Design a protein around this ligand. Structure first.
Ligand SMILES: [Mg+2]
Ligand SMILES: [Mg+2]
Ligand SMILES: [Mg+2]
Ligand SMILES: [Mg+2]
Ligand SMILES: [Mg+2]
Ligand SMILES: [Mg+2]
Ligand SMILES: [Mg+2]
Ligand SMILES: [Mg+2]
Ligand SMILES: [Mg+2]
Ligand SMILES: [Mg+2]
Ligand SMILES: [Mg+2]
Ligand SMILES: [Mg+2]
Ligand SMILES: [Mg+2]
Ligand SMILES: [Mg+2]
Ligand SMILES: [Mg+2]
Ligand SMILES: [Mg+2]
Ligand SMILES: [Mg+2]
Ligand SMILES: [Mg+2]
Ligand SMILES: [Mg+2]
Ligand SMILES: [Mg+2]
Ligand SMILES: [Mg+2]
Ligand SMILES: [Mg+2]
Ligand SMILES: [Mg+2]
Ligand SMILES: [Mg+2]
Ligand SMILES: [Mg+2]
Ligand SMILES: [Mg+2]
Ligand SMILES: [Mg+2]
Ligand SMILES: [Mg+2]
Ligand SMILES: [Mg+2]
Ligand SMILES: [Mg+2]
Ligand SMILES: [Mg+2]
Ligand SMILES: [Mg+2]
Ligand SMILES: [Mg+2]
Ligand SMILES: [Mg+2]
Ligand SMILES: [Mg+2]
Ligand SMILES: [Mg+2]
Ligand SMILES: [Mg+2]
Ligand SMILES: [Mg+2]
Ligand SMILES: [Mg+2]
Ligand SMILES: [Mg+2]
Ligand SMILES: [Mg+2]
Ligand SMILES: [Mg+2]
Ligand SMILES: [Mg+2]
Ligand SMILES: [Mg+2]
Ligand SMILES: [Mg+2]
Ligand SMILES: [Mg+2]
Ligand SMILES: [Mg+2]
Ligand SMILES: [Mg+2]
Ligand SMILES: [Mg+2]
Ligand SMILES: [Mg+2]
Ligand SMILES: [Mg+2]
Ligand SMILES: [Mg+2]
Ligand SMILES: [Mg+2]
Ligand SMILES: [Mg+2]
Ligand SMILES: [Mg+2]
Ligand SMILES: [Mg+2]
Ligand SMILES: [Mg+2]
Ligand SMILES: [Mg+2]
Ligand SMILES: [Mg+2]
Ligand SMILES: [Mg+2]
Ligand SMILES: [Mg+2]
Ligand SMILES: [Mg+2]
Ligand SMILES: [Mg+2]
Ligand SMILES: [Mg+2]
Ligand SMILES: [Mg+2]
Ligand SMILES: [Mg+2]
Ligand SMILES: [Mg+2]
Ligand SMILES: [Mg+2]
Ligand SMILES: [Mg+2]
Ligand SMILES: [Mg+2]
Ligand SMILES: [Mg+2]
Ligand SMILES: [Mg+2]
Ligand SMILES: [Mg+2]
Ligand SMILES: [Mg+2]
Ligand SMILES: [Mg+2]
Ligand SMILES: [Mg+2]
Ligand SMILES: [Mg+2]
Ligand SMILES: [Mg+2]
Ligand SMILES: [Mg+2]
Ligand SMILES: [Mg+2]
Ligand SMILES: [Mg+2]
Ligand SMILES: [Mg+2]
Ligand SMILES: [Zn+2]
Lengths: 37, 204, 174, 140
RNA sequence: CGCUGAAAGCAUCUAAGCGGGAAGCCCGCCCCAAGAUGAGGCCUCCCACGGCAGCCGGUAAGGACCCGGGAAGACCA
RNA sequence: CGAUGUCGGCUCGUCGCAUCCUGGGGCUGAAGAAGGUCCCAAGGGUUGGGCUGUUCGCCCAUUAAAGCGGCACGCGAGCUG
């Protein structure tokens, strides 16, 4: 999980989800998983 | 949650399977139940136990009425065991079997006014190298203007011992019913002649 | 585009009784009570249940789809029922039924016994296939998740407990 | 003419059902009753408000996410002695304290204010042991 | 980390709801503790005493004082 | 400035968390074992010695680890000097 202030789509499979008050990026590629913070 | 009242009689060791095992001997029974505490009546469950026969001439009237209601002889000590309700009207050492683990509560030996080194294992000061009249002193007790006070619970000199202590998970090494004797492995709080309470251990 | 507007086909004989804040669904396989937003209206027609929303507000739009799907899963649950299959993969890895219980041998120092909760039934056709079946869709999925979790698919080997139809995606070792 | 001052009066016992009411908005009214500010002879330096009985205090209500985010706090005086208790836990352990705390915070500080708080009797559950005072039911 | 799942026909641990999950948090263990003035409870003992929610007086159940002491203790307790 | 004693040590702690260890996680160029990196986490723990006034630091022998900071660079009506 990458934790950073700028979370962004990394590839075209990346999906920006909002979950429990936080912006996450989920993707089939585990590397692209992001949580904002 | 069984329990019994007792007197600490002394220490020895016995031999068991070619091992010296240190024991404390306790004279525990027999204890008459002189009152039962019930949920409907008292809001909880316990049994008031009596122990050591007393000279009736030393027992005043309100206490006497308390005993009589139980149909019980006058006794030196009344103590409750929490969450215990023996079927009989009398509790003996028989409630314990060798191998059982027990908790023992007693009044620890009194050291009276104790220093910081005896009470709290403080390090004290140097005994040479210039040390000046502080060989057994606490050292600093604080900071400076912030917070400009001393914490509650600061470890300091003062009375130490003659207080309730419970030692847990002691092995019952032997019980000798004809003498109301309990042998517990290891050390039990207080002096020989001290009053103790022996209870089934709360550790699993 | 709209799940909530889609009418729910109700096969006979299963009954749908509406109530305040809930709907009860009964069928050949059991009964289910579906908790339902008091803001939503659930309507029983001939061989059909429908759900209507009070407005086009974002929350009502959201509850609408949810509610129709929930009710639909209940309807399917008491009629057809729900199942999920698991494939055990790996050389020593096997399962067997022990009374009602599922016993997994998946390479720990011990076997794992999974206890069926009420409404859930385990079947072990092959030693490498397990089926979880029951009337409750979310429960079936939950228990199947639990059993897979016991020993999840390895990242490097075709080894562990898989959903039937789960792709085997592996990474190179060395 | 001097402003009228009341001779001591038989206080009025009052009964209130807390079920479904909003914690803070009910408290302000209980405080007013306690102070006796609803009475035309209100005098600020004597205890002359009502005795307030409250039932179903456990069923008090609260908006937003306060059940888990409102924190009651206690300081023991010892290092690290700050205790933090969320609303949910307080309700699940000593529910009557929730209203009690809300009201106590709305009473004047001082001897009279402390005395007024004692005239508040809060009970979780639908019953109180005060039939003897025959509390008059109050809608608020 | 999941289950079920819309808004958004797909998807989404979430917007409704439900799992799992730390030496950490609450409890559980040990010790203090009703001046907890919100001063709690239970068992038992005494009694409706004279004269003038108050005063004087002699009592009761009890207690203190004094003494012999104590692995209790600076005195006190 | 009709005085707020200034380094270092000792004693006694207590707090913060930007965590050294132990506990829980995600990613890995994660086969395993061992690591790297980030996230949660302050409950407890965080050795003895040589040098030097030293703080610090280097070194020796270990260790789960040998954390970093605040408290008048905490603490001289507590000691040292
Ligand atoms: Mg792109
Ligand atoms: Mg995806
Ligand atoms: Mg023997
Ligand atoms: Mg004792
Ligand atoms: Mg002594
Ligand atoms: Mg000392
Ligand atoms: Mg010592
Ligand atoms: Mg000691
Ligand atoms: Mg020393
Ligand atoms: Mg020295
Ligand atoms: Mg020394
Ligand atoms: Mg000198
Ligand atoms: Mg000297
Ligand atoms: Mg000192
Ligand atoms: Mg200073
Ligand atoms: Mg201060
Ligand atoms: Mg003492
Ligand atoms: Mg002795
Ligand atoms: Mg129909
Ligand atoms: Mg219509
Ligand atoms: Mg490698
Ligand atoms: Mg009013
Ligand atoms: Mg509110
Ligand atoms: Mg309570
Ligand atoms: Mg106030
Ligand atoms: Mg003011
Ligand atoms: Mg998934
Ligand atoms: Mg899904
Ligand atoms: Mg939710
Ligand atoms: Mg859960
Ligand atoms: Mg949960
Ligand atoms: Mg799970
Ligand atoms: Mg749990
Ligand atoms: Mg542990
Ligand atoms: Mg006690
Ligand atoms: Mg009392
Ligand atoms: Mg007490
Ligand atoms: Mg108070
Ligand atoms: Mg009392
Ligand atoms: Mg009670
Ligand atoms: Mg007498
Ligand atoms: Mg003496
Ligand atoms: Mg100056
Ligand atoms: Mg001066
Ligand atoms: Mg001056
Ligand atoms: Mg001066
Ligand atoms: Mg000065
Ligand atoms: Mg420090
Ligand atoms: Mg952190
Ligand atoms: Mg760690
Ligand atoms: Mg780790
Ligand atoms: Mg590894
Ligand atoms: Mg490798
Ligand atoms: Mg890692
Ligand atoms: Mg991370
Ligand atoms: Mg993270
Ligand atoms: Mg810590
Ligand atoms: Mg701490
Ligand atoms: Mg630390
Ligand atoms: Mg060192
Ligand atoms: Mg040398
Ligand atoms: Mg040195
Ligand atoms: Mg050095
Ligand atoms: Mg030297
Ligand atoms: Mg240097
Ligand atoms: Mg160098
Ligand atoms: Mg090593
Ligand atoms: Mg390591
Ligand atoms: Mg500092
Ligand atoms: Mg500085
Ligand atoms: Mg400096
Ligand atoms: Mg300094
Ligand atoms: Mg320093
Ligand atoms: Mg200093
Ligand atoms: Mg000096
Ligand atoms: Mg100095
Ligand atoms: Mg000073
Ligand atoms: Mg000074
Ligand atoms: Mg000083
Ligand atoms: Mg000073
Ligand atoms: Mg020196
Ligand atoms: Mg000099
Ligand atoms: Zn991607």
């Amino acid at each position: 999980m990458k934790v950073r202030a700028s979370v962004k789509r990394i590839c075209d499979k990346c999906k920006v989800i909002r979950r429990h008050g936080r912006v996450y990026v989920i993707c089939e590629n585990p590397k692209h998983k992001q949580r904002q913070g | 949650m069984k329990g019994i009242l007792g007197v600490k009689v002394g220490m020895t060791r016995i031999f068991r399977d070619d091992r010296a095992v240190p024991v404390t001997v306790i004279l525990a029974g027999p204890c008459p139940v002189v009152q039962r505490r019930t949920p409907e009546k008292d809001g909880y469950t316990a049994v008031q136990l009596g122990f050591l026969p007393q000279n009736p001439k030393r027992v005043n009237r309100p206490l006497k009425g308390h005993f009589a209601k139980a149909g019980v002889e006058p006794v030196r000590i009344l103590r409750e065991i929490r969450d215990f309700n023996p079927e009989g009207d009398t509790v003996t050492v028989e409630i314990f079997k060798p191998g059982e683990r027990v908790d023992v509560t007693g009044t620890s030996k009194g050291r009276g006014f104790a220093g910081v080194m005896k009470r709290w294992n403080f390090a004290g000061g140097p005994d040479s190298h210039g040390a000046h009249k502080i060989h057994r002193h606490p050292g600093s007790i604080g900071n400076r203007k912030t917070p400009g006070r001393v914490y509650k619970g600061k470890k300091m000199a003062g009375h130490y011992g003659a207080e309730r202590v419970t030692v847990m998970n002691l092995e019952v090494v032997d019980v000798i019913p004809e003498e109301n004797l309990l042998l517990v492995k290891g050390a039990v709080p207080g002096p020989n002649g001290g009053l103790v309470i022996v209870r089934e251990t709360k550790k699993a | 585009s709209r799940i909530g507007r889609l009418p729910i086909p109700v096969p006979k004989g299963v009954s749908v009784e509406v109530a305040p804040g809930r709907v009860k669904v009964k069928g050949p396989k059991g009964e289910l009570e579906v908790p339902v937003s008091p803001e939503m209206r659930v309507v029983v027609e001939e061989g059909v249940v429908r759900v209507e929303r009070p407005s086009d507000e974002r929350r009502h739009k959201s509850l609408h789809g949810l509610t129709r799907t929930l009710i639909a899963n209940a309807v399917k649950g008491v009629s057809e029922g729900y199942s999920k299959e698991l494939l055990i993969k790996g050389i020593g890895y096997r399962a067997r039924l022990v009374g009602r219980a599922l016993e997994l041998t998946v390479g720990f120092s011990h076997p794992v016994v999974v206890e069926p909760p009420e409404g859930i039934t385990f079947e072990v056709p092959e030693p490498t296939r397990v089926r979880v079946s029951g009337i409750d869709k979310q429960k079936v999925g939950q228990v199947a998740a639990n059993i897979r979790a016991i020993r999840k698919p390895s990242a490097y080997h075709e080894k562990g407990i898989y959903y039937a139809g789960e792709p085997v995606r592996l990474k190179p070792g060395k | 003419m001097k402003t009228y001052v009341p001779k001591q009066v038989e206080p009025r016992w009052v009964l209130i059902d807390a079920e479904g009411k909003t914690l803070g908005r009910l408290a302000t009214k209980i405080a007013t009753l306690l102070r006796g500010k609803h009475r035309p002879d209100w005098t600020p330096n004597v205890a002359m408000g009502d005795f307030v009985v409250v039932v179903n205090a456990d069923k008090i209500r609260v908006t937003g996410k306060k059940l888990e985010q409102k924190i009651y706090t206690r300081y023991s005086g010892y290092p690290g002695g700050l205790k933090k208790i969320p609303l949910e836990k307080m309700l699940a352990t000593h529910p009557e304290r929730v209203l009690e705390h809300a009201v106590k915070g709305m009473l004047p500080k001082g001897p009279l204010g402390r005395r007024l708080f004692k005239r508040l009797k809060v009970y979780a559950g639908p019953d109180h042991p005060h039939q003897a005072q025959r509390p008059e039911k109050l809608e608020v």
